[PDB]
Design a protein around this ligand. Structure first.
Ligand SMILES: N[C@H]1[C@H](Oc2ccc([N+](=O)[O-])cc2)O[C@H](CO)[C@@H](O)[C@@H]1O
Length: 850
């Protein structure tokens, strides 16, 4: 029942190996080979050893000769085997693109068989293994994402020099007796009342010995004993189906905030002759999911009978697929700190632990295949990936089986996208549906993330109409343009493009002169944006920032304006979709922000950056997604309350006030006694009238207080008397140009205010520190302290990351106080005492001890 991952390898180019058979012979010399940990691409392995500078900085990645990655590389290891009484297997996936496998001088599998990143291989190497020092070697072939059913980077970033060739998951060494236990899973079915489930346990047993056997498969499912005995001819595999097991009052798995995240255990041993032969432990969640088309044709998800608006971002791993379990948990925890409920994985489907963590945290996941490369090559015409040939078909089907087998018992998984872009043709789709059936993968299948239908499954109920680059806030509120990206249907991949990270991140990824060019000439190409010509520069963003904000006087000016613009836009993108969710006609049913994060240090399509720092786009998404929320509609000036939580709320007061930039209140409305339903329902407080005498740029302060008088949401907008308007006729696929621009340049002259800071920290016994900061607007006039950003820093003024704040980027009127809370690992302080750096738009910068 042993399954031990290979901890590491030594790697080298096949340019250095003239005899393949030699590598896997015990004693083969490996002087000058590179030691690498498990889950390394070739280039990630070279970085581990020195060998090139940090690709996260400037154009370092360009200085890597890529030619060396157009030939195979070897991954080699020794294995000590004390006792050959047990059978021996190599069980693995994640080979990019394909490999020959060698044990002790014998080629056990070729690249024609071991082919495709997602395919699983269970290689019986019993005949090759001997007592003592054994050796195993993979000759990994070059990866081309357009030719191979693998992973590529579309236009998200820049191309890794090795194109991710390597082994990016574990290779397991399995030991067992005559009988191998495989593919153990639990089919679970809950009644609609959610108080009774039925469990069908299924498990494969394979007799790899020379003789016929009886095997008993026995153990526990959800704490209940189970046992079946079957016969197996030599070399026979069987699927064992256990009689149905009833489960009363199951601990139902819920998305975060809707209840708990319990997973049950399955524990099984296959015995032969009254002796354990193999063993497997796994988990499953008791949870119903559905994804159906509503009367408007939009894809509508529900979990456990509760419909949900999907509010998420597109998730990506590291550009060089460097794996770290804590980092993965840190990234999914940020999902919840944002108030989001879902992540989409367009290809790049992460190792199991990622899904264990999403399960444990209650983050929903939307895995599927990616566009714009080999996956869609047979259906995507003149776009990138190659037409399919006969050998492609069984690789794609085996990839689907293997992913379906991996993914089926994770309750976070809410669907599989079998297409992205183009939906599969009938033959490809049929192979996917067959693979999923064979794996008992029973979750919703979505044909595409675009509007494109598949022949069998049908309409997607989703859209990808853009945009991916600058559009003003009001754009998201559009319902009139059926070929655009307004708040209706399921928005599976959309953003307003550029997302300048914090100054602290900027200074780590770009040179002074690259940064100088970024503010002075946004039209210039930026390596840390995209390899795509369409998204190669920041021109649309820079032009709108100038038009709407005012010209940038320096780098600092440009960055600070970038943050307001990103906060404003991302906030509107999300708020519009929350509002329109309960529309009678063409409701919004989903929004996946493009993207949650970036594969590397970037200037676009991120909420949190590669270092886990949090900028305007982050805080804006967090503001929009708070559980009891007040917001202002850019289209019609309606003030709207959203309740994200699982219970209806009552006796809410919504208070809306307009101020000129000199602090003069120009409008007040107090709406008491509001009720709002659960799980995304809304209430309208008031429609703000056109008010006379407003400054060109003015402020709207929205405050929601519960029946106890507690302030539960504060939302401040910087607004203009001059409207953003669209030139809909100038629209391209990725954006819509503006015919006129809001004037928010009044912010440039907003008078100075003051804060107002005290902080203290508590090192907990769970290895985390909580820093509490109390901020007060301490000025003696009428001016608000506007957009005040607090950052946990060490003694050198460097941000402590990752971090989670309850609230941030706050605005306080004179006399007003707010208390803020930041949590992080004590160890990420690295022995420094904590301080807090506090910067406001109109309050300057100070740091206080904590
Ligand atoms: N799935 C990709 C998405 O695919 C689309 C296909 C068609 C349209 N369209 O036709 O408006 C829009 C988007 O394009 C993004 C931006 O290039 C990529 O980053 C995503 O990975």
């Amino acid at each position: 029942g042993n399954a031990t991952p290979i901890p590491g390898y030594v790697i080298q180019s096949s340019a250095q190996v003239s005899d393949d058979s030699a590598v896997s012979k015990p004693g083969f010399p490996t002087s000058g080979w590179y030691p690498v940990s498990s889950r390394s691409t070739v280039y990630a392995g070279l970085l581990q050893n020195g060998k090139y500078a940090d690709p996260f900085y400037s154009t370092n990645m360009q200085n890597v000769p890529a030619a060396q990655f157009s030939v195979p590389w070897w991954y080699r290891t020794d294995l000590n085997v004390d006792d050959t009484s047990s059978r021996t297997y190599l069980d693995f996936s994640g080979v990019l693109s394909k490999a020959d496998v060698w044990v002790n001088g014998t080629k056990v599998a070729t690249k024609d068989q071991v082919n495709g990143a997602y395919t699983r291989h269970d290689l019986d190497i019993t005949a090759q293994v001997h007592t003592g020092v054994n050796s195993v070697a993979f000759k990994v072939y070059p990866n081309d994402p357009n030719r191979d059913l693998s992973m590529g980077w579309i236009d998200w970033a820049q191309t890794p020099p090795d194109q991710n060739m390597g082994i990016v998951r574990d290779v397991l060494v399995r030991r067992s007796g005559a009988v191998a236990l495989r593919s153990a899973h639990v089919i679970q079915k809950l009644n609609s009342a959610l108080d009774h489930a039925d469990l069908t346990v299924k498990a494969d047993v394979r007799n790899d010995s020379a003789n016929a056997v009886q095997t008993t498969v026995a153990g526990t499912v959800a704490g209940k004993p189970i046992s079946q005995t079957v016969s197996l001819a030599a070399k026979e595999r069987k699927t064992v189906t256990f009689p149905l097991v009833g489960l009363d009052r199951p601990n139902v798995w819920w998305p975060a905030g809707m209840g708990g995240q319990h997973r049950y255990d399955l524990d099984l041993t296959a015995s032969v002759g009254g002796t354990p032969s193999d063993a497997a432990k796994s988990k499953f969640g008791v949870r119903d999911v559905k994804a159906t088309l509503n009367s408007s044709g939009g894809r509508q998800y529900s979990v456990n009978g509760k419909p949900l608006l999907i509010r998420g971002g597109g998730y990506t791993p590291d550009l060089f697929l460097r794996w770290n379990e804590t980092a993965a948990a840190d990234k999914l925890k940020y999902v919840l700190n944002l108030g989001l409920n879902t992540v989409r994985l367009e290809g790049h489907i992460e190792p199991d632990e990622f899904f264990d963590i999403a399960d444990d945290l209650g983050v929903l996941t939307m895995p599927g295949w990616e566009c714009c490369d080999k996956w869609e090559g047979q259906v995507n015409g003149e776009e990138k990936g190659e037409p399919w040939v006969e050998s492609d078909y069984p690789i794609a089907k085996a990839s689907m089986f293997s992913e379906a087998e991996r993914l089926r018992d994770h309750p976070s998984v809410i669907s599989f996208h079998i297409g992205s872009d183009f939906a599969p043709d009938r033959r490809i789709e049929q192979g996917y549906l067959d693979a999923m059936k064979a794996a008992d993968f029973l979750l919703p299948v979505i044909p595409a993330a675009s509007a494109r239908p598949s022949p069998i499954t049908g309409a997607s109920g989703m859209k990808m109409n853009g945009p991916y680059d600058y559009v003003p806030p009001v754009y998201w509120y559009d319902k009139s343009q059926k070929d655009r990206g307004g708040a209706w249907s399921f928005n599976s991949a959309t953003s307003a493009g550029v997302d300048i990270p914090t100054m602290d991140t900027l200074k780590r990824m770009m040179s002074a002169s690259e940064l100088d060019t970024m503010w002075k000439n946004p039209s210039a190409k930026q390596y840390h944006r995209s390899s795509s010509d369409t998204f190669g520069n920041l021109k649309l963003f820079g032009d709108a920032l100038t038009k709407r904000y005012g010209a940038s006087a320096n780098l600092n000016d440009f960055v600070r304006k970038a943050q307001l613009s990103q906060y404003e836009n991302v906030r509107a993108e999300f708020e519009s979709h929350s509002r329109n969710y309960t529309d009678s006609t063409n409701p919004s049913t989903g929004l996946i922000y493009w993207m949650l994060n970036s594969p590397w240090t970037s200037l676009h399509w991120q909420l949190f950056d590669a270092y886990m720092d949090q900028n305007g786009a982050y805080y804006g998404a967090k503001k929009a997604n708070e559980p009891l929320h007040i917001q202002y509609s850019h289209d019609n000036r309606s003030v709207v309350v959203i309740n994200q939580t699982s219970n209806a709320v009552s006796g809410l007061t919504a208070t809306t006030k307009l101020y000129n930039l000199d602090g003069t209140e120009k409008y007040s409305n107090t709406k008491t006694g509001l009720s709002v339903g659960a799980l995304g329902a809304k209430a309208t407080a008031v429609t703000v009238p056109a008010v006379s005498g407003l400054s060109t740029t003015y402020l709207a302060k929205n405050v929601l207080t519960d029946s106890s008088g507690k302030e539960v949401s504060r939302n401040v907008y910087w607004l203009s008397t001059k409207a953003d308007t669209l030139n809909w006729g100038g629209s391209d696929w990725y954006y819509t140009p503006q015919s006129a621009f809001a004037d928010l340049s009044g912010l440039n002259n907003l008078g100075q205010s003051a804060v107002g800071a005290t902080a203290n920290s508590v090192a907990g016994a769970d290895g985390t520190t909580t820093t509490t900061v109390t901020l007060k607007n301490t000025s003696g006039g009428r001016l608000p302290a506007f957009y005040v950003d607090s950052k946990v820093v060490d003694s050198a003024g460097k941000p402590v990351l990752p971090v989670e704040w309850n609230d941030n980027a706050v605005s306080l009127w004179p006399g007003e106080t707010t208390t803020l809370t930041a949590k992080y690992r004590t160890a990420d302080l690295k022995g420094s005492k904590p301080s807090v750096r506090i910067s406001g738009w109109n309050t300057g910068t100070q740091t206080v001890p904590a």
